[PDB]
Each structure stands twice: as structure tokens, then as C-alpha cells.
A paper describes a structure:
Vaccines and therapeutics targeting the critical viral spike glycoprotein (S) must accommodate the mutations in S. Even the highly conserved region that plays a critical role in membrane fusion exhibits up to three mutations in the HR1 region of Omicron variants. To reduce the public health threat of Omicron and future emerging variants, we and others have proposed development of antivirals targeting the relatively conserved heptad repeat 1 and 2 (HR1 and HR2) regions of the spike glycoprotein (S) that drive membrane fusion by the formation of the HR1HR2 postfusion bundle.
Starting with the previously reported longHR2_42 peptide we chose to insert an additional residue between HR2 residues G1167 and D1168 which are proximal to the Omicron HR1 K969 sidechain, anticipating that this insertion would restore inhibition activity. We selected glycine due to its flexibility, hydrophilicity, and proximity to the naturally occurring glycine in HR2 (G1167) (peptide referred to as 42G). To confirm our prediction that 42G better accommodates the Omicron N969K mutation, we determined the cryo-EM structure of the complex of the Omicron HR1 and a slightly longer version of 42G, termed 42Gv2, to an overall resolution of 2.8 Å. The structure of the 42Gv2—Omicron HR1 complex maintains the overall six-helix-bundle architecture of the SARS-CoV-2 postfusion bundle and the packing between K969 and F970. In addition, the structure features a bulge of the 42Gv2 backbone at the inserted glycine residue. This bulge results from the deviation of the 42Gv2 backbone around the long sidechain of the lysine residue of the mutated HR1 N969K, promoting closer overall packing with HR1; additionally, the terminal nitrogen of this lysine and the carbonyl oxygen of the inserted G form a hydrogen bond, presumably contributing additional binding energy to the interface. Additionally, the insertion reduces the overall displacement of HR2 in this region, partially restoring the HR2 backbone to the original position in the Wuhan strain structure. The average Cα atom rmsd for HR2 residues 1,162 to 1,170 is reduced from 2.4 Å (between the Wuhan strain HR1HR2 structure and the Omicron HR1HR2 structure) to 1.5 Å (between the Wuhan strain HR1HR2 structure and the Omicron HR1—42Gv2 structure). Our structure of the Omicron HR1—42Gv2 complex shows that the glycine insertion restores the backbone interactions on both sides of the inserted glycine and Omicron HR1.
Author numbering:
A (entry chain B), B (entry chain A), C (entry chain C): 918 to 988
D (entry chain D), E (entry chain F), F (entry chain E): 1159 to 1201
The structure:
Amino acid sequence: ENQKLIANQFNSAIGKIQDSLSSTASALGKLQDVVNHNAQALNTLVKQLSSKFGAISSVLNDIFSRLDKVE
Amino acid sequence: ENQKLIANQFNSAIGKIQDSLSSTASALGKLQDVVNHNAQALNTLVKQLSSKFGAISSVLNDIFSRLDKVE
Amino acid sequence: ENQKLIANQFNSAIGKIQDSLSSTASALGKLQDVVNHNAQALNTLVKQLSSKFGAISSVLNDIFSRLDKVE
Amino acid sequence: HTSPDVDLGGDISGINASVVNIQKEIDRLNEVAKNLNESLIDL
Amino acid sequence: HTSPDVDLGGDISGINASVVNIQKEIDRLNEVAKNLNESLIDL
Amino acid sequence: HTSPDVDLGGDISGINASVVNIQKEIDRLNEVAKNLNESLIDL
């Protein structure tokens, strides 16, 4: 009878730990997807910012060139 | 006696696994708070960058307009 | 004999839960390293962006000053 | 002719950052950490 | 009159990114993964 | 003399964001959640 109690409560504990491991797996999966998304987004921001700032550089350069042409 | 050993060590194991699940819960909670903070921050950066760059656009536009007025 | 079965399967379950806790520890460690890297990167981006935009501010200011000098 | 509008470059509005919602899983972990007391053996 | 100072827009200094410190929890998980060997049954 | 090239400031290309790959650990967690059924006691 005590063996039946140990077996039943061990089966219950293993079921609950299975649920906990499935929950931890799902949570780490969502965290992975989100952190990777944000990383790709920050990398895209870095690259396209580099592009836009280079464009701004060229624009200001032509600005200063026109100014020198005037003066 | 062997049943008492099994019961005691199973109780110890379940206590340690309770501590581990509480630690995993706290860790995932902190990771969630931090990743969400960083996501909101990156979104704020994106929006306010869009604003500042639009402003720069208007400014350079007026610049070029004044230049054309001169030349 | 049933006690030997309970003991063997409990040892197997504790071994598998040890593997699962080691995997969760490694996963949270990698997530921590990556989220902290991305946070430092976003902070660096914020600071150096502030710098570049201040520079752009000064440049446009001198631009407008030269313009006023012309006109 | 006058100068055209300056196209400063890419449209940074396309960038966006998702938001992770794992409160279900964290709450489940805490619920299990509390329910494992219903599985302790008491001979 | 001369042109005023250009206000390029928002003050991006307000943006900031936190840093997660879960080394306590990771160390606790490894400590438990090592201490579960003190709970293996040996009849 | 003409004006020099404007150095807009820092070289933002040095910034970069890593990518976390914990699919090994997530797959191991699911494999263990499936293998714990081989450890349930059936007297």
C-alpha cells in the first residue's frame, strides 16, 4: 500500500515536471524567436542607418560645395 | 526502512526541483521584463529617429531652396 | 523487487531532470549573454547616434550661418 | 531647374521589434512549483 | 533677422536599454543539477 | 580654400547584435519531456 502511494505520487510529480519542462521549452522558444527578431531588427537599423547617414553626408557635402561656389 | 529512504530522498528531490522551478520562473520573468523593455526602447528609437530624420529632410529641403534662391 | 523498480526509475527520472536543468541553465546563460550584448549594442547606438546628430546639428547651423552671411 | 526633393535614403519605418509574452509559461511554472507540495510523500 | 537654431527633433537621450542579471538563477540551477546527486536512491 | 569633407561623427558600423541559438537546449527539453514517460512507475 505504501508502495502504491509512492508510485502514485511519483507519477503525479513526473507528470507535473513534464508540464513544467514543456512550459520552459515553450518559453525559451518564444524568447529565442523574439530576441532573434529584435537582433535582426537592430542589425537592419544599423545598416540602413549607415546608408541614410552616408546619404546625409553626400548631401551636406554638395551643400558645402554649392556654398563655396557662391562664395 | 527502504521505503522511508525512498520517501525521504524523493521529498528532497521534489524540494530541490521546486527550488529549480522557482529559479527558472524568476529568470524567465526577468528576461521577459528586460526583453520587453529593450523592445519598447528600440521601437521608441525607431519612431523618434523617423521624426528626427523627417525634420532633417525638411531642413535640407529649405537649405536647397534658399540655395536655389541665391543661384 | 518493486522497491528496486521504484528506485531504478526514480534514479532514471532524476538523471533526466538533471540533464533538463543543465540544459535550462545553458539556455538561460546564452540568452543572458545575447540579451546583454544587444542591450550594450543598443546603448552604444543611442550614444553614438546622439553624437552624430549633434554633429549634424552643428553642421546645419554653420550652413544656415553661411547662408545668412550670403543673404 | 530647381533642385528636387532629397531622398535621404531607406524608409526606417519598416523596422519593428516584437514583444515576447511568456507570462502563461511563467505562471504555469509557479503554479507547478506550488502544486508539487501536493506530491510530497508522507508515509 | 538671422535664422534661429535648428531643433532637429526629439531628444534621443531618453532612450535606454536595461541589462538582465539572472546569474543568481543560473547558478542556482547548476547548483541544483549538481545537488540532485545527493538525492539518488541507493538501496 | 574650399571646405573639407564633413566628418559626421562616429562610425556606427562597429555596432552589431548577436543572435542566440538555443535550439539544442529547447530540443533537449522537449526530448526529456517526452522521455520522462519511460520513467513512470507501473507496479
